[PDB]
Design a protein around this ligand. Structure first.
Ligand SMILES: CCCCCCCC/C=C\CCCCCCCC(=O)OC[C@H](COP(=O)(O)OCCN)OC(=O)CCCCCCC/C=C/CCCCCCCC
Ligand SMILES: CCCCCCCC/C=C\CCCCCCCC(=O)OC[C@H](COP(=O)(O)OCCN)OC(=O)CCCCCCC/C=C\CCCCCCCC
Ligand SMILES: CCCCCCCC/C=C\CCCCCCCC(=O)OC[C@H](COP(=O)(O)OCCN)OC(=O)CCCCCCC/C=C\CCCCCCCC
Lengths: 704, 717, 316
């Protein structure tokens, strides 16, 4: 229905066109009449008057009639109705030319369709009441439709130019019609003087004729002139309305004054022209459409829907704990962040997973109990009070940057931040991430874990080395290079490098003089020859070099004796030396799933050992000196090549854990009762080895 | 009607021009019928059949009646008026009728009309389809809507197969345009040539002197000038018509409309696999492009096979909802939550919305692609691939590398086995079913079994002829290897001695007929069943005493003719299952085994049942079914722990009353046998209930009714 | 009534040709009513009941009133103008009305109309049946569509038993075609033999000498020549009609339409058990094949019993 885009001028001109078509049809029907002109010759050859005998037949009179009709009657008086028909056909064709164009009609239908969707939508009067479930979803869908319309019609200007063209054509046609009709209306005369030279056929040369319907055609011409004058005045007003104000722009400033929303912008071009058209039809439509045009109103609708969907009771259901013993709210794939979430003030940790296009309001100042924030694959925005409060309060952060921009740039305005979990991925141009090297504003940062394909340690870490303490990096097959950035670590205490492809332990680790622990996880350490400088790490107690390729262990282990935790599980070690067990302070020694041939007896030196794992070895001989070491709390010798469990095993008083699983044993001795801290769980073995205890020993063992 | 979409702008313009031309024809026809005449006056002065043209002026007396004038008018109008000035409106009418017939021929000719109606109908239905709106926006799908989308998609495919064969519509449209332009040319030629013959003044020399008195007359044709301008206006319209036709002809010679490339739409839309239609499909698509490209845009997403796959996947998601899936949830042999998806097009995301699933079973799904949401299935440990080509991604591989410890792959082809399954970091249990020996693929399908360092169970139903050494390397942690080969002998060659951790070597249908030394060299083996291996003799039990852990010799389903008396040397077995054999008689030596808790001797040729069966105090189930056994000894009833006595289909004479010593009897089968009447002691057994006492009914009725009532009350209370 | 599927190209062509013959008849009838007159002038010089035709010329004076002229015109129009030139429009009216009656008799006659509508209804329902799409695609089947497919199957079997016994529709179409072709032959014969009698110049001899004074008059028939073109052009249309009808006759004598062979369709489709139908059903399947092959191919699947077994086991 295009009637909503037909103003009063268009309807008036259409009705005038219908009237002019009626006039033309009536004139043509009058032209159908056979008896048209009546001619009598001039100078023909109480008072009694006598008629003049012209001495002519009826056929001579008819011949004179047609001769004078063809050659003496003006062409206007004979073809005026046909000209009216042609002119009114042109007017009718060029009056719908804006409507019936291919590209214009689709835009018109789209505009009127979504405008009617507005005029029937509950969210319009709902939005006025906001200014002054299902319906919210339909509101959001219609809002996406409104944005689609903005990107779909506003670009072009075909409608306005086409309407201007058709109006100008109407005006010029009206001018031509008025001019020529007013010029030639004086030629429609009743009495005509015909001077055809048919003296040879009839006998006369001069005739006086009467055009019978000359009065009727004169009245029809004057009526058509009046109709065309009204049509042209209407078209001139159309031109005046088109050009007196710029219809290429429409200001929503009237709604800006009425509606409290000021984000409502001023659309232009075809949008503007069709808004002016519907304002000519009904001014309420544009005012109601404006509350759907603005996008801050869209943000308000999104917030209202966010608060409506998730009641606080649902958030009570969602409440849980996390890996750091904090009250966590897991929010998964959400449209945004509800204010109902911030209404909870007992909350200690926030988990936002792929909730993008999210702006953090001041309302987070409600919940003071936050300590952890999980901003996972979500591009988040911020507000000033939120910056201030999260500067003051937030300390633990765990973000995932699937996309580099999905890392927000505002993590670094804080200072109270202490823990950081930088899980994700990185590209080749590592040093260009200025986001990393802004942690100079962080003063309290102490935990940094970067699961990413990071090849070069940034100068960020170099700057923040003064207060940073823990590193956890998972490269996952990516080679780590540029280790001077880890050289200029000074106060760092923990270093866990996973899959960094570090062939050798760099001088970076030995430049560290206060490293509590080191992890060289998934790092291809074929040989260990740089341990000479490892003595500088006096704080080093943990050396978790597991799943590694250390083929043999040299004497350089004597450089550091403060070593306590020693994980060489799944190592390439063949034979242990005499020189490991000199460092008596070692308590925590791992060789799990290795392939050691045998255990030499120098193990007797490690008395302060509390953990000795050599599981899944090829060790066929356990000498009794490890059984002599009684401080050995854990001792895992599983799946080796040993033969018999030691009968004098009850001497180990403080033997908490003896994993000897899968060992080829024959019969358990009865002295497991003398062992104070060895269980069936502790002495994990195959069940045919479990079945071997004496009956009284079963009575003493089932009661422990 | 609905053919407005089929007619382009030029067709509408030609229709309007034809309407105006028909108005010309009607107006001229009415004027010719009613008012067309000649008004002829005789020439008084005639010089060689020519009007010679030679006080007060007076009229010429012709001395002719009105009827002689009418006769002269009719004769001169008939003879000396040109045929064009007379039959111009009728020629116009004929030309308009031919033009309208040519323009609307394909809408009336049935062969083209059927194709046009079919195309327009399915195109309008696809335009109005909600799946069109979903595709352009790309969900909530009503089942009427979903079935409409699937059925109409199939309709589109069938219509393409039905209409792509022929090109009749394009040929008919071409012929119509060519006729409409050649007739335009002929009309212009003959109309422009003869338009000057419509004259007002006409001289007629008709030779009717014997009837009138004059030979030459000078007529005036009144409806000439009007006719002239009508002809001019007609010519104008014809020119316009012709011009339009030429453009249409040019539009059908610029590009081959029988080859409509979907290039712009397939670049713009996500579905880039839209095939290029041909022939009448292409031509009608070009026409609908001329009308409105949005029609073709909305029809394009209904031809692409990527849209086939996406609509099929989303329809699959809409069919199989989470609730009926929870109803269909079952449990496997390991009492783990399993889901048997049989004959599915894909895996619905409702499966992946779960978090407690542990056994994801995928059976006969064609080339499915696993989305990452499997990582939500937090407890996932098993995975069953039966005739299913599986395609998986990296987060799925991560959650399976940290959680998944089982993988059950059944196949009949190499390509059914995916290449991802070798990248798991927690894989522990693994059954490969189907042939693994092929060209460049014999154990090289699965060469990534070195990467799996935590395997503990390996079942291979593969029709195998050799064992890889890499399995022997893995066997440091692997504890069970059961190879099913459907009657194919492997070459062991003592390459199995790295099975230090193997505990259950199960050679099913191996047809070995011999025991290699590697079987009794492996000290941790506890389960040994040489099933269907056709052992005529078993002679390798003596060397098993170095193996301290053997506890269960389930020697079943074999050709074993006799047991040597040296079997009495064993004591430590519990589940001695010697069923489905050809043992002539059970010996007393076999009852030297004191630790027997379970004894199955089903389907044997035992001559009788000796007394020493009662040497089995800890024995729980006993199945000497399908034997030749007549009496159970009292020693058997001193054993208090008999529970499952499958004694049926035997020749049992009677059960001695010392069976009253039995207490723990649970299940007994007596359909068969020769037991004349039930001893009441069979009713005495407490643990033996109606489900366990599978017994004849008449001998049960021989018992006193109150004992039956006590058993009934124990059953029902 | 959606009978367009029962009208092949010959039927549509003959309908349009009959419409244009209607227009000929109405136009010629209007002209013969309004302006068919005769202008008769007496032959002054008489030679044995015939016209002799023998400075400034002077008009011939007949000394006749205008009413004597009108009487002469009426008498020579009724007596001497040939009846073809007077009643050609009424004859073409009658002929094309009989042509329309022959075309639409099987549509208006209840015995054939009921069977035509019954067959058209089930053909249209089977053309839109989902089971047809599924089987031509050939198990997923909803209970409701399965019920409606089984109902349509039972309707197909019962209507096959109801219609395959008789052959009235084919017989009526045959009779209409023979009547149309023989009437084409008769019309062509008499119209071509009588078209030469439409003359502009007619000599009339009516013997009204006591009322007029003259015996022989020469008459002009103003609407003769136009009628001639009309007649000639009308003849052309009938020729086309006859030729079209001839093809129809040849088609209905090319092969026995009372036996329809599904041989091609049941060969190309999986179902090779499709039975050969007989009599009326065969004829209307042939007409539908002349309209569109796909309708017949789709209805072929509702007649085989292997498709019935497949539907039963899918429903089971
Ligand atoms: C497709 C083919 C179309 C042809 C079909 C023709 C239809 C009509 C044919 C039958 C016409 C019947 C009349 C025939 C004999 C004529 C009799 C006669 O001369 O009557 C006179 C009379 C004129 O009167 P005068 O004497 O001038 O009156 C002056 C005092 N007021 O002539 C007539 O017009 C005949 C009246 C019959 C009416 C039939 C239709 C007349 C034409 C109507 C045309 C109107 C169209 C207007 C629209 C044009 C622009 C859109
Ligand atoms: C743009 C503005 C146009 C300005 C004027 C346009 C006409 C220019 C006039 C040219 C001119 O004067 O030439 C005369 C010339 C001939 O005149 P005579 O009678 O010989 O002159 C006698 C001398 N007194 O007159 C004309 O050409 C008249 C102009 C055209 C008249 C009709 C135009 C349209 C004709 C088609 C009619 C269509 C009706 C169809 C009816 C449908 C019914 C079913
Ligand atoms: C391009 C093809 C052109 C076709 C026209 C051929 C014209 C050739 C001329 C033949 C000729 O000279 O014959 C004249 C002869 C008349 O003159 P006479 O007095 O016999 O001869 C005296 C000559 N002054 O005229 C003709 O034969 C011309 C033929 C014109 C055919 C026009 C066709 C008309 C068709 C009738 C359809 C009417 C249907 C109306 C429907 C009404 C709906 C309500």
């Amino acid at each position: 229905a295009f009637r909503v885009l037909k103003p009063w001028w268009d309807v008036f001109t259409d009705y005038l066109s219908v009237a002019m078509l009626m006039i033309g049809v009536f004139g043509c029907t009058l032209q159908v009449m056979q008896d048209k002109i009546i001619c009598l010759p001039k100078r023909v050859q109480t008072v009694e008057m006598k008629g003049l005998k012209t001495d002519l037949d009826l056929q001579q009179y008819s011949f004179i009639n047609q001769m004078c009709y063809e050659r003496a009657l003006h062409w206007y008086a004979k073809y005026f109705p046909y000209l009216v028909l042609i002119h009114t056909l042109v007017f009718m064709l060029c009056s719908n030319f804006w409507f019936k164009f291919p590209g214009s009609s689709s835009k018109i239908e789209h505009f009127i369709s979504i405008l009617g969707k507005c005029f029937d939508s509950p969210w319009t009067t709902r939005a006025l009441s906001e200014v002054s479930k299902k319906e919210g979803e339909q509101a959001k869908a219609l809002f996406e439709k409104v944005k689609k319309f903005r990107l779909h019609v506003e670009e072009g200007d075909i409608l306005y130019a086409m309407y201007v063209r058709q109006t100008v054509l109407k005006v010029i046609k009206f001018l031509i019609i008025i001019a020529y009709n007013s010029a030639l209306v004086s030629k429609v005369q009743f009495t005509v003087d015909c001077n055809v030279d048919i003296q040879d056929m009839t006998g006369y040369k001069n005739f006086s004729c009467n055009h019978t319907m000359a009065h009727l055609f004169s009245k029809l011409s004057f009526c058509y002139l009046c109709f065309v004058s009204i049509y042209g005045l209407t078209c001139l007003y159309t031109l005046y309305w088109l050009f007196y104000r710029s219809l290429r722009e429409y200001s929503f400033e009237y709604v800006r004054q009425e509606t409290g929303i000021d984000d409502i912008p001023d659309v232009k071009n075809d949008f503007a022209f069709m808004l002016h058209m519907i304002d000519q039809y009904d001014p309420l439509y544009s005012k109601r459409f404006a509350v759907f045009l603005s996008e801050v109103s869209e943000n308000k609708l999104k917030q209202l829907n966010l608060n409506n969907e998730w009641t606080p009771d649902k958030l009570r259901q969602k409440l849980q704990t996390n890996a750091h013993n904090r009250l966590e709210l897991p929010l998964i794939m959400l449209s945004g962040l509800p204010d109902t979430v911030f209404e909870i003030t007992e909350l200690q940790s926030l988990k936002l997973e792929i909730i993008k296009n999210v702006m953090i309001p001041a309302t987070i100042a409600q919940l003071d109990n936050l300590q952890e924030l999980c901003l996972h694959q979500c591009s988040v925005k911020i507000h000033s009070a939120a910056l201030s409060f999260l500067k003051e309060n937030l300390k633990v952060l765990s973000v995932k940057f699937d996309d580099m921009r999905e890392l927000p740039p505002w993590m670094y305005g804080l200072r109270n931040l202490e823990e950081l979990y930088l899980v994700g991925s990185l590209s080749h141009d590592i040093s260009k991430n200025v986001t990393l090297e802004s942690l100079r504003d962080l003063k309290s940062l102490k935990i940094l874990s970067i699961k990413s394909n990071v090849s070069k340690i940034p100068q960020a870490v170099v700057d923040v080395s003064s207060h940073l303490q823990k590193m956890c990096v998972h490269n996952d097959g990516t080679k780590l290079v540029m280790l001077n950035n880890l050289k200029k670590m000074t106060n760092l205490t923990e270093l866990e490098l996973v899959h960094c492809d570090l062939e050798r332990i760099p001088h970076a680790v030995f430049s560290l003089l206060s490293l509590q622990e080191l992890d060289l996880k998934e790092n291809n350490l074929k040989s260990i020859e740089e341990i000479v400088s490892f003595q500088h790490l006096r704080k080093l107690t943990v050396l978790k070099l597991w799943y590694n390729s250390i083929a043999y262990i040299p004497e350089h282990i004597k450089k550091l004796t403060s070593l306590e935790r020693l994980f060489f599980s799944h190592n390439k070690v063949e034979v242990l030396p005499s020189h490991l067990f000199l460092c008596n302070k070692i308590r925590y020694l791992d060789l799990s799933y290795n392939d050691i041939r045998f255990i030499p007896p120098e193990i007797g030196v490690l008395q302060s050992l509390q953990y000795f794992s050599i599981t899944c070895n090829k060790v066929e001989s356990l000498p009794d000196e490890l059984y002599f070491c009684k401080k050995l709390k854990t001792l895992k010798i599983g799946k080796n090549s040993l033969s018999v469990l030691s009968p004098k095993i009850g001497n180990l008083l403080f033997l908490s854990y003896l994993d000897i699983k899968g060992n080829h044993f024959e019969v358990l001795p009865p002295e497991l009762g003398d062992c104070r801290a060895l269980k069936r769980a502790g002495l994990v073995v195959e069940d045919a080895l479990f079945e071997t205890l004496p009956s009284d020993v079963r009575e003493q063992m089932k009661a422990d | 009607p609905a053919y407005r979409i089929l007619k382009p702008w030029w067709d509408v313009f030609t229709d309007y021009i034809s309407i105006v031309m028909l108005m010309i024809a009607v107006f001229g026809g009415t004027l010719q019928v009613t008012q067309d005449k000649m008004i002829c006056l005789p020439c008084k002065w005639v010089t060689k059949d020519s009007c010679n043209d030679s006080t007060g002026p007076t009229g010429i007396k012709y001395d002719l009646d009105r009827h002689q004038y009418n006769y002269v008018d009719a004769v001169c109008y008939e003879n000396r008026l040109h045929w064009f000035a007379k039959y111009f409106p009728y020629l116009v009418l004929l030309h308009t009728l031919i033009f309208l017939a040519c323009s609307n021929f394909w809408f009336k000719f049935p062969r083209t009309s059927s194709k046009l109606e079919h195309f327009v109908s399915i195109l309008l239905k696809c335009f109005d389809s909600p799946w069109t709106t979903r595709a352009l926006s790309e969900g909530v799908l009503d089942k009427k809507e979903g079935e409409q989308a699937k059925a109409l998609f199939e309709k589109v495919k069938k219509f393409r197969t039905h209409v792509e064969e022929g090109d009749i519509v394009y040929r008919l449209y071409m012929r119509q345009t060519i006729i409409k332009v050649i007739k335009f040319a002929l009309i212009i030629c003959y109309t422009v040539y003869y338009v000057h013959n419509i004259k007002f003044d006409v001289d007629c020399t008709v030779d009717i002197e014997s009837l009138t008195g004059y030979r030459t007359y000078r007529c005036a044709h009144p409806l000439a000038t009007l006719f002239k301008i009508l002809a001019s206006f007609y010519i104008s319209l014809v020119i316009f018509y012709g011009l339009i036709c030429m453009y249409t002809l040019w539009w059908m010679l610029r590009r081959s409309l029988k080859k409509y490339s979907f290039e712009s739409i397939r670049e713009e839309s996500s579905y880039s696999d839209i095939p290029d239609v041909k022939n009448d499909f292409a031509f009608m698509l070009h026409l609908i492009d001329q009308y409105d490209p949005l029609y073709s845009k909305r029809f394009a997403v209904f031809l692409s096979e990527v849209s086939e796959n996406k609509l099929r996947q989303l329809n699959l998601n809409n069919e199989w909802t989470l609730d009926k899936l929870r109803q269909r949830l079952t449990k496997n042999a390991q009492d783990k939550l399993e889901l048997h998806l049989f004959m599915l097009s894909g895996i619905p995301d409702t499966v992946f919305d779960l978090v407690e699933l542990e056994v994801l079973k995928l059976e006969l799904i064609p080339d499915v692609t696993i989305p990452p949401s499997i990582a939500q299935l937090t407890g996932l440990k098993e995975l069953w691939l039966y005739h299913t080509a599986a395609k998986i991604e990296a987060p799925a591989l991560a959650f399976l590398r940290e959680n998944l410890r089982a993988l059950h792959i059944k196949f009949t082809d190499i390509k059914e086995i995916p290449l991802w399954i070798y990248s798991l970091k927690t894989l522990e249990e693994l059954h490969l079913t189907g042939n693994l020996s092929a060209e460049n693929n014999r154990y090289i399908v699965i060469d990534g079994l070195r990467e799996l360092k935590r395997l503990k169970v390996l079942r291979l139903k593969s029709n195998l002829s050799k064992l890889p050494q890499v399995v022997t390397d893995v066997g440091v942690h692997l504890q069970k290897l059961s190879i099913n080969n459907e009657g194919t002998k492997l070459i062991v060659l003592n390459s199995l001695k790295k099975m230090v951790n193997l505990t259950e070597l199960e050679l099913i249908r191996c047809d070995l007929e011999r025991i290699p030394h590697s079987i009794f060299s492996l000290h941790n083996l506890q389960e040994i069943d040489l099933k269907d291996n056709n052992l005529k003799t078993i002679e390798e039990i003596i060397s098993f005493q170095h193996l301290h852990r053997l506890t269960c010799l389930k020697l079943w389903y074999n050709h074993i003719a006799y047991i040597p008396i040296q079997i009495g040397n064993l004591t430590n077995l519990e589940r001695l299952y010697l069923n489905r054999n050809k043992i002539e008689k059970i010996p007393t030596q076999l009852f030297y085994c004191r630790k027997l808790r379970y004894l199955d001797l089903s389907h044997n040729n035992l001559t009788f049942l000796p007394a020493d069966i009662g040497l089995l105090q800890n024995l729980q189930n006993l199945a000497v079914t399908a034997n030749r056994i007549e009496a159970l000894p009292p020693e058997l009833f001193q054993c208090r722990k008999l529970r499952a006595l499958h004694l049926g289909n035997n020749v049992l004479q009677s059960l001695p009353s010392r069976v009253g010593e039995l207490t723990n009897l649970t299940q007994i089968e007596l359909r068969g046998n020769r037991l004349e009447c039930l001893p009441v002691e069979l009713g005495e057994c407490p643990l033996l209930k109606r489900s366990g006492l599978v017994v004849e009914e008449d001998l049960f009725s021989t018992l006193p009714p109150e004992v039956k009532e006590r058993l009934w009350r124990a059953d029902k209370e």
